[PDB]
Design a protein around this nucleic acid. Structure first.
Lengths: 110, 46, 55, 102
RNA sequence: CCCGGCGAGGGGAGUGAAAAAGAACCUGAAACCGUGUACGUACAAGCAGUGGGAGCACGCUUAGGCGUGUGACUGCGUACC
RNA sequence: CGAAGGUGUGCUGUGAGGCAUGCUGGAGGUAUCAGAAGUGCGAAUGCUGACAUAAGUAACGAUAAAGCGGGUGAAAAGCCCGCUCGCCGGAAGACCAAGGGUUCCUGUCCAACGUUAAUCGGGGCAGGGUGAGUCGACCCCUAAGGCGAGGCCGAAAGGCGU
Protein backbone atom coordinates (compact mmCIF):
# COMPACT_ATOMS: atom_id res chain seq x y z
CA UNK A 1 0.00 0.00 0.00
CA UNK A 2 1.18 3.50 -0.92
CA UNK A 3 -0.12 6.71 0.62
CA UNK A 4 0.27 10.22 -0.78
CA UNK A 5 0.34 13.74 0.61
CA UNK A 6 0.73 17.08 -1.18
CA UNK A 7 1.28 20.81 -0.65
CA UNK A 8 0.36 22.94 -3.67
CA UNK A 9 1.19 26.61 -4.31
CA UNK A 10 3.89 26.66 -1.63
CA UNK A 11 5.77 29.96 -1.31
CA UNK A 12 9.38 29.07 -2.13
CA UNK A 13 11.61 28.13 -5.05
CA UNK A 14 11.83 24.55 -6.27
CA UNK A 15 15.63 24.80 -6.37
CA UNK A 16 15.67 25.68 -2.67
CA UNK A 17 13.23 22.97 -1.59
CA UNK A 18 15.05 20.22 -3.51
CA UNK A 19 18.15 20.68 -1.33
CA UNK A 20 16.15 19.53 1.71
CA UNK A 21 14.15 16.92 -0.20
CA UNK A 22 17.38 15.14 -1.15
CA UNK A 23 18.25 14.40 2.50
CA UNK A 24 15.40 12.00 3.30
CA UNK A 25 14.88 9.94 0.12
CA UNK A 26 14.60 6.26 1.02
CA UNK A 27 14.84 6.47 4.83
CA UNK A 28 12.66 5.16 7.63
CA UNK A 29 10.12 7.67 8.88
CA UNK A 30 11.53 8.02 12.40
CA UNK A 31 15.03 8.62 11.06
CA UNK A 32 13.65 11.16 8.58
CA UNK A 33 11.78 13.11 11.26
CA UNK A 34 14.96 13.26 13.36
CA UNK A 35 16.92 14.53 10.35
CA UNK A 36 14.36 17.24 9.62
CA UNK A 37 14.20 18.49 13.20
CA UNK A 38 17.84 19.67 13.07
CA UNK A 39 18.15 21.31 9.63
CA UNK A 40 18.36 25.11 9.88
CA UNK A 41 16.34 25.85 6.75
CA UNK A 42 12.88 27.22 6.05
CA UNK A 43 12.00 24.41 3.62
CA UNK A 44 12.43 21.88 6.44
CA UNK A 45 9.28 23.08 8.23
CA UNK A 46 7.13 22.69 5.10
CA UNK A 47 8.53 19.27 4.22
CA UNK A 48 8.01 18.08 7.80
CA UNK A 49 4.35 19.07 7.83
CA UNK A 50 3.76 17.16 4.58
CA UNK A 51 5.46 14.02 5.92
CA UNK A 52 3.36 14.12 9.08
CA UNK A 53 0.17 14.41 7.02
CA UNK A 54 1.15 11.36 4.95
CA UNK A 55 1.78 9.25 8.06
CA UNK A 56 -1.60 10.20 9.55
CA UNK A 57 -3.36 9.30 6.29
CA UNK A 58 -1.68 5.90 6.26
CA UNK A 59 -2.83 5.26 9.83
CA UNK A 60 -6.44 6.39 9.46
CA UNK A 61 -7.48 5.49 5.91
CA UNK A 62 -5.51 2.26 5.35
CA UNK A 63 -4.79 0.60 8.70
CA UNK A 64 -1.00 0.86 8.58
CA UNK A 65 1.66 0.59 11.28
CA UNK A 66 4.16 3.37 11.92
CA UNK A 67 7.15 1.12 12.62
CA UNK A 68 7.07 -0.41 9.11
CA UNK A 69 6.88 2.72 6.94
CA UNK A 70 9.51 4.16 4.61
CA UNK A 71 9.70 7.25 2.41
CA UNK A 72 9.37 5.58 -0.98
CA UNK A 73 9.05 8.69 -3.16
CA UNK A 74 9.46 12.46 -2.83
CA UNK A 75 9.59 15.21 -5.43
CA UNK A 76 9.14 18.93 -6.06
CA UNK A 77 7.70 20.62 -9.16
CA UNK A 78 7.39 24.25 -10.29
CA UNK A 79 4.22 26.30 -10.07
CA UNK A 80 2.94 29.64 -11.37
CA UNK A 81 4.95 32.82 -10.88
CA UNK A 82 3.64 36.21 -9.79
CA UNK A 83 4.94 39.24 -11.69
CA UNK A 84 5.91 42.53 -10.04
CA UNK A 85 7.55 45.83 -11.01
CA UNK A 86 10.65 47.29 -9.30
CA UNK A 87 11.98 50.76 -10.26
CA UNK A 88 15.66 51.45 -11.00
CA UNK A 89 17.70 54.57 -11.79
CA UNK A 90 17.08 57.16 -14.52
CA UNK A 91 13.43 56.15 -14.92
CA UNK A 92 13.84 52.50 -15.94
CA UNK A 93 11.73 49.63 -14.60
CA UNK A 94 12.52 45.94 -14.10
CA UNK A 95 10.45 42.79 -13.62
CA UNK A 96 10.44 40.58 -10.52
CA UNK A 97 9.33 36.93 -10.45
CA UNK A 98 7.93 35.36 -7.27
CA UNK A 99 8.26 31.61 -7.70
CA UNK A 100 6.22 28.80 -6.14
CA UNK A 101 6.37 25.00 -5.99
CA UNK A 102 4.38 21.80 -5.44
CA UNK A 103 5.61 19.19 -2.93
CA UNK A 104 4.67 15.48 -3.02
CA UNK A 105 5.52 12.70 -0.51
CA UNK A 106 4.72 8.96 -0.82
CA UNK A 107 5.10 6.50 2.09
CA UNK A 108 4.88 2.72 1.86
CA UNK A 109 5.24 -0.41 3.97
CA UNK A 110 6.99 -2.55 1.35
CA UNK B 1 14.17 70.19 -7.78
CA UNK B 2 11.10 72.06 -8.99
CA UNK B 3 8.92 70.20 -11.49
CA UNK B 4 6.43 71.35 -14.11
CA UNK B 5 3.03 70.65 -12.49
CA UNK B 6 2.04 73.05 -9.68
CA UNK B 7 -1.70 72.69 -8.99
CA UNK B 8 -4.27 75.43 -8.41
CA UNK B 9 -8.03 74.88 -8.67
CA UNK B 10 -9.00 78.45 -9.57
CA UNK B 11 -6.49 78.55 -12.43
CA UNK B 12 -7.54 75.10 -13.64
CA UNK B 13 -11.19 76.15 -13.84
CA UNK B 14 -10.49 79.51 -15.47
CA UNK B 15 -8.32 77.82 -18.11
CA UNK B 16 -10.20 74.64 -19.11
CA UNK B 17 -13.68 74.82 -17.58
CA UNK B 18 -17.16 74.41 -19.03
CA UNK B 19 -18.01 78.11 -19.18
CA UNK B 20 -14.65 78.95 -20.78
CA UNK B 21 -15.29 76.31 -23.43
CA UNK B 22 -18.78 77.72 -24.03
CA UNK B 23 -17.57 81.31 -24.39
CA UNK B 24 -15.95 80.71 -27.81
CA UNK B 25 -16.84 79.09 -31.13
CA UNK B 26 -13.87 76.70 -31.08
CA UNK B 27 -14.62 75.54 -27.53
CA UNK B 28 -18.06 74.47 -28.66
CA UNK B 29 -16.34 72.44 -31.38
CA UNK B 30 -14.26 70.69 -28.72
CA UNK B 31 -17.46 69.86 -26.82
CA UNK B 32 -19.19 68.55 -29.96
CA UNK B 33 -16.20 66.34 -30.79
CA UNK B 34 -16.15 64.88 -27.28
CA UNK B 35 -19.90 64.24 -27.24
CA UNK B 36 -19.62 62.52 -30.64
CA UNK B 37 -16.89 60.24 -29.31
CA UNK B 38 -19.00 59.51 -26.23
CA UNK B 39 -16.72 60.41 -23.34
CA UNK B 40 -17.88 59.98 -19.76
CA UNK B 41 -16.18 63.19 -18.55
CA UNK B 42 -16.64 66.25 -20.76
CA UNK B 43 -14.49 68.94 -19.08
CA UNK B 44 -12.32 69.28 -15.96
CA UNK B 45 -15.03 70.82 -13.77
CA UNK B 46 -16.21 68.58 -10.96
CA UNK C 1 31.58 42.07 -19.31
CA UNK C 2 29.00 39.55 -20.53
CA UNK C 3 28.81 36.17 -22.25
CA UNK C 4 29.21 35.64 -25.99
CA UNK C 5 27.41 32.26 -26.05
CA UNK C 6 24.66 30.79 -23.87
CA UNK C 7 25.83 28.19 -21.30
CA UNK C 8 24.28 24.72 -21.24
CA UNK C 9 22.27 22.72 -18.71
CA UNK C 10 25.21 20.31 -18.52
CA UNK C 11 27.46 23.14 -17.30
CA UNK C 12 24.79 24.32 -14.87
CA UNK C 13 24.74 20.86 -13.31
CA UNK C 14 28.52 20.59 -13.21
CA UNK C 15 28.83 23.89 -11.32
CA UNK C 16 26.05 22.89 -8.92
CA UNK C 17 27.76 19.57 -8.08
CA UNK C 18 29.16 21.13 -4.84
CA UNK C 19 25.90 22.42 -3.31
CA UNK C 20 24.55 19.39 -1.45
CA UNK C 21 23.76 19.63 2.26
CA UNK C 22 25.19 17.51 5.09
CA UNK C 23 23.17 15.79 7.81
CA UNK C 24 24.00 15.43 11.49
CA UNK C 25 26.01 12.27 12.12
CA UNK C 26 24.23 11.23 15.32
CA UNK C 27 22.34 12.52 18.33
CA UNK C 28 23.11 12.01 22.02
CA UNK C 29 20.90 10.62 24.80
CA UNK C 30 20.67 12.17 28.26
CA UNK C 31 21.49 9.78 31.10
CA UNK C 32 18.58 10.78 33.38
CA UNK C 33 15.68 11.81 31.12
CA UNK C 34 16.39 9.73 28.00
CA UNK C 35 15.82 12.58 25.53
CA UNK C 36 17.79 13.11 22.31
CA UNK C 37 19.75 16.33 21.83
CA UNK C 38 22.64 17.95 19.99
CA UNK C 39 26.00 17.08 21.52
CA UNK C 40 27.23 19.72 24.00
CA UNK C 41 23.77 21.38 24.05
CA UNK C 42 21.00 21.24 26.65
CA UNK C 43 17.77 19.34 25.99
CA UNK C 44 14.32 20.75 25.25
CA UNK C 45 13.15 20.15 28.84
CA UNK C 46 16.18 21.70 30.55
CA UNK C 47 18.68 18.92 31.25
CA UNK C 48 22.41 18.75 30.60
CA UNK C 49 24.61 15.78 31.51
CA UNK C 50 21.92 14.42 33.83
CA UNK C 51 21.17 17.60 35.79
CA UNK C 52 18.15 19.88 35.49
CA UNK C 53 19.33 23.44 34.86
CA UNK C 54 16.34 25.50 33.69
CA UNK C 55 12.85 25.39 35.18
CA UNK D 1 -52.75 29.57 -23.63
CA UNK D 2 -50.92 26.68 -21.97
CA UNK D 3 -51.55 22.99 -22.52
CA UNK D 4 -50.14 21.79 -19.16
CA UNK D 5 -51.38 23.36 -15.93
CA UNK D 6 -51.05 22.92 -12.18
CA UNK D 7 -52.93 20.06 -10.51
CA UNK D 8 -52.95 17.88 -13.64
CA UNK D 9 -52.20 14.19 -14.02
CA UNK D 10 -49.36 13.38 -16.41
CA UNK D 11 -47.20 10.51 -17.66
CA UNK D 12 -43.46 10.79 -18.38
CA UNK D 13 -42.25 10.38 -21.97
CA UNK D 14 -38.44 10.55 -21.77
CA UNK D 15 -35.64 10.02 -19.27
CA UNK D 16 -34.88 7.58 -16.48
CA UNK D 17 -38.44 7.89 -15.11
CA UNK D 18 -39.99 6.94 -18.47
CA UNK D 19 -43.49 5.57 -17.83
CA UNK D 20 -44.38 6.93 -14.39
CA UNK D 21 -47.36 9.03 -13.36
CA UNK D 22 -47.86 11.94 -10.99
CA UNK D 23 -49.31 15.37 -10.32
CA UNK D 24 -48.02 18.82 -11.28
CA UNK D 25 -47.00 20.90 -8.26
CA UNK D 26 -45.99 24.21 -9.84
CA UNK D 27 -45.01 25.72 -13.18
CA UNK D 28 -41.88 27.81 -13.74
CA UNK D 29 -41.38 30.59 -16.26
CA UNK D 30 -38.44 28.90 -18.02
CA UNK D 31 -40.50 26.00 -19.38
CA UNK D 32 -40.15 23.42 -16.58
CA UNK D 33 -42.45 21.74 -14.06
CA UNK D 34 -42.16 19.99 -10.70
CA UNK D 35 -44.04 16.66 -10.59
CA UNK D 36 -44.64 14.76 -7.35
CA UNK D 37 -42.31 11.82 -6.75
CA UNK D 38 -40.44 12.25 -10.03
CA UNK D 39 -36.82 13.19 -10.80
CA UNK D 40 -35.35 12.88 -7.31
CA UNK D 41 -31.87 14.05 -6.30
CA UNK D 42 -29.70 13.72 -3.19
CA UNK D 43 -28.46 17.05 -1.83
CA UNK D 44 -25.65 17.46 0.73
CA UNK D 45 -27.05 20.12 3.06
CA UNK D 46 -24.85 22.10 5.45
CA UNK D 47 -26.14 22.94 8.95
CA UNK D 48 -26.99 26.46 10.06
CA UNK D 49 -27.41 27.46 13.74
CA UNK D 50 -29.96 30.11 12.75
CA UNK D 51 -33.48 28.80 12.07
CA UNK D 52 -32.65 25.68 14.15
CA UNK D 53 -31.88 23.47 11.17
CA UNK D 54 -29.26 20.68 11.07
CA UNK D 55 -27.55 19.26 7.98
CA UNK D 56 -27.75 15.92 6.26
CA UNK D 57 -28.33 14.21 2.94
CA UNK D 58 -31.83 15.10 1.71
CA UNK D 59 -33.94 13.79 -1.18
CA UNK D 60 -35.93 16.27 -3.25
CA UNK D 61 -37.52 16.81 -6.66
CA UNK D 62 -35.80 18.60 -9.54
CA UNK D 63 -37.44 20.39 -12.45
CA UNK D 64 -38.13 18.59 -15.74
CA UNK D 65 -38.73 19.95 -19.24
CA UNK D 66 -42.41 20.47 -19.97
CA UNK D 67 -42.25 18.97 -23.45
CA UNK D 68 -41.20 15.66 -21.82
CA UNK D 69 -44.61 15.02 -20.19
CA UNK D 70 -48.05 14.24 -21.59
CA UNK D 71 -51.58 14.56 -20.26
CA UNK D 72 -53.03 11.22 -19.13
CA UNK D 73 -56.41 9.94 -20.39
CA UNK D 74 -58.09 7.64 -17.87
CA UNK D 75 -60.73 6.39 -20.32
CA UNK D 76 -58.14 4.92 -22.69
CA UNK D 77 -55.20 4.50 -20.31
CA UNK D 78 -52.77 6.29 -22.62
CA UNK D 79 -50.97 9.56 -23.28
CA UNK D 80 -52.66 12.22 -25.39
CA UNK D 81 -52.36 15.63 -27.05
CA UNK D 82 -54.42 18.76 -26.31
CA UNK D 83 -56.41 21.20 -28.45
CA UNK D 84 -58.45 24.38 -28.00
CA UNK D 85 -62.00 25.33 -28.98
CA UNK D 86 -64.85 27.67 -27.99
CA UNK D 87 -67.99 26.05 -26.58
CA UNK D 88 -70.42 28.60 -25.09
CA UNK D 89 -68.47 31.84 -24.89
CA UNK D 90 -65.30 30.44 -23.39
CA UNK D 91 -62.15 28.66 -24.52
CA UNK D 92 -61.67 25.05 -23.44
CA UNK D 93 -59.18 22.22 -23.84
CA UNK D 94 -60.08 18.86 -25.37
CA UNK D 95 -58.43 15.49 -26.03
CA UNK D 96 -57.52 14.71 -29.62
CA UNK D 97 -58.01 10.93 -29.50
CA UNK D 98 -61.77 11.00 -28.86
CA UNK D 99 -62.70 14.72 -29.00
CA UNK D 100 -63.79 14.85 -25.35
CA UNK D 101 -63.66 18.01 -23.23
CA UNK D 102 -61.22 18.04 -20.30
C1' C E 1 -14.42 11.51 9.55
C1' C E 2 -8.92 12.58 9.64
C1' C E 3 -3.58 15.76 9.62
C1' G E 4 -2.88 21.08 10.12
C1' G E 5 -2.67 27.66 13.37
C1' C E 6 -11.00 26.95 14.99
C1' G E 7 -5.08 28.37 8.53
C1' A E 8 -3.45 27.65 3.22
C1' G E 9 -3.18 22.79 1.26
C1' G E 10 -4.32 17.69 1.22
C1' G E 11 -6.38 12.07 2.14
C1' G E 12 -11.02 9.28 2.47
C1' A E 13 -16.67 8.92 2.12
C1' G E 14 -20.73 10.55 -1.07
C1' U E 15 -22.97 12.78 -6.34
C1' G E 16 -22.64 11.91 -11.52
C1' A E 17 -21.99 8.37 -17.82
C1' A E 18 -17.27 10.64 -16.54
C1' A E 19 -13.99 14.42 -10.93
C1' A E 20 -6.12 13.84 -14.51
C1' A E 21 -15.39 17.12 -15.80
C1' G E 22 -13.88 20.29 -8.62
C1' A E 23 -15.01 26.01 -9.74
C1' A E 24 -6.93 28.41 -11.44
C1' C E 25 -13.17 23.58 -14.19
C1' C E 26 -14.23 20.93 -22.96
C1' U E 27 -9.87 19.22 -25.80
C1' G E 28 -4.85 20.00 -23.52
C1' A E 29 0.47 20.74 -28.76
C1' A E 30 5.83 23.05 -28.18
C1' A E 31 9.72 25.69 -25.81
C1' C E 32 11.23 25.09 -20.59
C1' C E 33 11.78 21.94 -15.38
C1' G E 34 11.82 17.07 -12.63
C1' U E 35 11.46 11.49 -10.53
C1' G E 36 12.70 6.06 -12.12
C1' U E 37 15.15 2.15 -15.30
C1' A E 38 19.15 0.22 -19.37
C1' C E 39 23.83 1.29 -21.40
C1' G E 40 28.38 4.91 -21.80
C1' U E 41 32.03 8.35 -19.33
C1' A E 42 37.51 10.51 -14.41
C1' C E 43 45.50 9.64 -19.73
C1' A E 44 41.78 12.78 -22.86
C1' A E 45 42.31 17.85 -27.55
C1' G E 46 38.40 21.13 -32.46
C1' C E 47 30.76 22.48 -36.46
C1' A E 48 29.76 17.07 -32.36
C1' G E 49 27.98 13.91 -37.67
C1' U E 50 28.90 10.11 -41.44
C1' G E 51 31.31 4.97 -43.14
C1' G E 52 33.42 0.64 -40.35
C1' G E 53 32.83 -1.93 -35.58
C1' A E 54 33.65 -5.16 -30.34
C1' G E 55 31.15 -5.66 -25.67
C1' C E 56 26.57 -5.29 -22.40
C1' A E 57 20.94 -5.36 -21.50
C1' C E 58 16.39 -6.85 -23.42
C1' G E 59 11.69 -9.49 -27.02
C1' C E 60 10.75 -13.30 -30.44
C1' U E 61 12.54 -17.89 -32.08
C1' U E 62 11.53 -22.72 -37.35
C1' A E 63 17.48 -23.40 -31.23
C1' G E 64 18.72 -21.65 -37.48
C1' G E 65 18.26 -16.09 -36.84
C1' C E 66 16.32 -11.57 -36.50
C1' G E 67 14.55 -7.16 -34.18
C1' U E 68 15.11 -2.91 -30.51
C1' G E 69 18.44 0.50 -26.96
C1' U E 70 23.53 2.04 -25.84
C1' G E 71 28.15 2.63 -28.18
C1' A E 72 34.78 1.67 -26.35
C1' C E 73 38.27 2.01 -30.68
C1' U E 74 39.28 3.76 -35.86
C1' G E 75 39.08 6.63 -41.83
C1' C E 76 36.95 11.32 -43.54
C1' G E 77 35.06 16.07 -42.07
C1' U E 78 35.96 24.43 -40.42
C1' A E 79 27.19 25.96 -39.38
C1' C E 80 22.86 28.56 -42.14
C1' C E 81 21.15 33.22 -44.78
C1' C F 1 -20.35 -1.14 -31.81
C1' G F 2 -16.92 5.97 -31.31
C1' A F 3 -16.31 12.05 -35.82
C1' A F 4 -12.67 15.95 -36.03
C1' G F 5 -8.26 17.02 -33.14
C1' G F 6 -3.71 15.07 -29.95
C1' U F 7 0.20 10.91 -29.39
C1' G F 8 2.98 5.95 -30.85
C1' U F 9 3.77 1.83 -34.41
C1' G F 10 3.76 -0.97 -39.24
C1' C F 11 3.68 -0.78 -44.48
C1' U F 12 4.06 1.95 -49.29
C1' G F 13 5.57 5.69 -53.96
C1' U F 14 11.11 9.21 -57.62
C1' G F 15 9.31 13.59 -54.42
C1' A F 16 5.62 17.21 -52.34
C1' G F 17 2.89 12.80 -49.76
C1' G F 18 -0.60 8.32 -48.92
C1' C F 19 -2.90 3.98 -46.32
C1' A F 20 -3.99 0.73 -42.01
C1' U F 21 -4.13 0.15 -36.89
C1' G F 22 -3.16 0.59 -30.56
C1' C F 23 -3.94 4.66 -26.50
C1' U F 24 -6.30 9.59 -25.54
C1' G F 25 -11.11 12.34 -27.08
C1' G F 26 -16.48 12.76 -26.63
C1' A F 27 -19.91 14.73 -31.97
C1' G F 28 -19.25 15.57 -36.06
C1' G F 29 -16.78 14.19 -41.29
C1' U F 30 -16.86 13.62 -46.57
C1' A F 31 -15.41 9.77 -51.90
C1' U F 32 -15.34 10.81 -57.44
C1' C F 33 -15.45 14.58 -61.15
C1' A F 34 -15.58 19.84 -61.66
C1' G F 35 -15.48 25.32 -59.72
C1' A F 36 -13.15 29.76 -56.53
C1' A F 37 -8.79 31.48 -53.51
C1' G F 38 -7.02 35.80 -46.99
C1' U F 39 -3.36 28.53 -50.36
C1' G F 40 2.32 26.41 -47.94
C1' C F 41 7.65 30.65 -43.59
C1' G F 42 13.83 30.16 -40.40
C1' A F 43 15.69 34.75 -41.27
C1' A F 44 13.08 41.36 -42.76
C1' U F 45 18.01 45.15 -35.39
C1' G F 46 9.74 41.76 -38.36
C1' C F 47 4.51 41.98 -34.66
C1' U F 48 1.86 39.70 -29.95
C1' G F 49 2.11 35.92 -25.72
C1' A F 50 4.86 32.21 -22.95
C1' C F 51 9.55 30.48 -21.09
C1' A F 52 15.28 30.22 -20.54
C1' U F 53 20.71 32.22 -19.66
C1' A F 54 23.88 35.14 -16.70
C1' A F 55 22.65 33.16 -10.76
C1' G F 56 20.69 31.52 -6.01
C1' U F 57 25.37 36.07 -8.29
C1' A F 58 24.68 42.13 -7.33
C1' A F 59 21.59 44.53 -3.96
C1' C F 60 17.81 45.25 0.64
C1' G F 61 17.95 53.55 0.09
C1' A F 62 22.21 58.32 4.69
C1' U F 63 27.86 55.04 9.82
C1' A F 64 21.99 58.87 15.18
C1' A F 65 23.11 52.63 18.35
C1' A F 66 21.57 49.51 21.17
C1' G F 67 21.21 45.68 26.04
C1' C F 68 18.29 42.82 29.27
C1' G F 69 13.48 41.07 32.19
C1' G F 70 8.09 40.01 31.94
C1' G F 71 3.23 39.39 28.50
C1' U F 72 0.47 37.45 24.33
C1' G F 73 0.93 33.88 20.66
C1' A F 74 1.41 27.76 16.45
C1' A F 75 5.94 30.85 16.11
C1' A F 76 8.88 37.17 18.89
C1' A F 77 15.98 40.75 16.99
C1' G F 78 11.43 44.27 14.95
C1' C F 79 4.39 44.29 18.60
C1' C F 80 2.76 45.73 24.25
C1' C F 81 4.65 46.97 29.54
C1' G F 82 9.35 48.12 32.62
C1' C F 83 14.58 49.74 33.79
C1' U F 84 19.19 51.50 31.36
C1' C F 85 21.81 53.71 26.89
C1' G F 86 22.14 57.04 22.48
C1' C F 87 20.25 61.31 18.68
C1' C F 88 17.64 66.41 17.32
C1' G F 89 16.24 70.85 19.96
C1' G F 90 15.83 78.58 15.20
C1' A F 91 14.25 71.35 14.67
C1' A F 92 14.41 65.74 13.31
C1' G F 93 9.28 70.43 18.31
C1' A F 94 4.15 73.04 18.02
C1' C F 95 0.57 75.45 14.50
C1' C F 96 -1.89 78.04 9.74
C1' A F 97 -2.77 78.81 4.03
C1' A F 98 -2.30 76.00 -0.61
C1' G F 99 -2.84 70.79 -2.36
C1' G F 100 -5.11 65.96 -1.09
C1' G F 101 -9.98 63.41 0.45
C1' U F 102 -11.62 59.27 5.24
C1' U F 103 -5.61 58.40 5.44
C1' C F 104 -9.12 60.06 11.94
C1' C F 105 -11.07 56.41 16.72
C1' U F 106 -12.80 51.31 18.25
C1' G F 107 -13.29 45.87 17.17
C1' U F 108 -11.64 41.75 14.20
C1' C F 109 -8.12 39.05 10.03
C1' C F 110 -2.72 38.03 7.90
C1' A F 111 -3.92 35.57 1.25
C1' A F 112 -1.83 39.82 -1.70
C1' C F 113 0.74 45.01 -0.47
C1' G F 114 5.25 46.43 3.45
C1' U F 115 12.61 45.41 -0.44
C1' U F 116 13.28 40.16 5.73
C1' A F 117 9.58 37.73 10.09
C1' A F 118 5.14 39.83 11.65
C1' U F 119 0.70 38.52 16.81
C1' C F 120 2.04 44.98 13.86
C1' G F 121 0.40 49.04 9.78
C1' G F 122 -1.30 54.98 6.25
C1' G F 123 -3.24 46.90 4.12
C1' G F 124 -8.72 43.75 3.98
C1' C F 125 -13.79 43.83 6.41
C1' A F 126 -17.72 46.20 9.79
C1' G F 127 -19.32 50.08 13.11
C1' G F 128 -18.58 55.15 15.00
C1' G F 129 -16.92 60.49 14.67
C1' U F 130 -16.99 67.14 12.21
C1' G F 131 -22.72 70.95 16.79
C1' A F 132 -21.14 78.87 15.69
C1' G F 133 -25.24 86.03 15.75
C1' U F 134 -18.96 87.04 17.44
C1' C F 135 -13.70 81.98 13.41
C1' G F 136 -13.86 81.75 7.72
C1' A F 137 -16.83 81.66 3.04
C1' C F 138 -21.25 83.92 1.06
C1' C F 139 -22.43 89.55 1.43
C1' C F 140 -21.21 95.72 0.70
C1' C F 141 -16.51 98.30 -2.20
C1' U F 142 -13.19 98.91 -5.72
C1' A F 143 -7.07 97.51 -8.56
C1' A F 144 -4.40 95.22 -12.90
C1' G F 145 -7.36 92.97 -16.38
C1' G F 146 -12.05 90.60 -18.70
C1' C F 147 -17.04 90.90 -20.95
C1' G F 148 -19.85 94.58 -23.16
C1' A F 149 -27.07 97.23 -24.86
C1' G F 150 -26.83 101.02 -28.65
C1' G F 151 -22.01 102.57 -31.56
C1' C F 152 -17.49 102.41 -35.21
C1' C F 153 -14.87 98.97 -38.45
C1' G F 154 -14.18 94.30 -41.27
C1' A F 155 -15.36 88.81 -47.93
C1' A F 156 -17.87 85.45 -43.95
C1' A F 157 -15.98 83.83 -39.25
C1' G F 158 -15.07 88.29 -36.38
C1' G F 159 -11.86 93.25 -33.99
C1' C F 160 -12.09 97.74 -30.70
C1' G F 161 -14.82 100.25 -27.50
C1' U F 162 -19.47 104.14 -24.45
Amino acid sequence: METIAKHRHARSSAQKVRLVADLIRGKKVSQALDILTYTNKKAAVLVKKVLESAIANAEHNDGADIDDLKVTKIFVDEGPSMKRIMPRAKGRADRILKRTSHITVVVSDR
Amino acid sequence: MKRTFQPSVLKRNRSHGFRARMATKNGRQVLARRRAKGRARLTVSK
Amino acid sequence: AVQQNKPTRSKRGMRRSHDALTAVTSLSVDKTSGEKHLRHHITADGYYRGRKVIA
Amino acid sequence: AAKIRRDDEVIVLTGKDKGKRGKVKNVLSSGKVIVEGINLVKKHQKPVPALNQPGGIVEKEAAIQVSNVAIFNAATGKADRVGFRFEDGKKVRFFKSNSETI
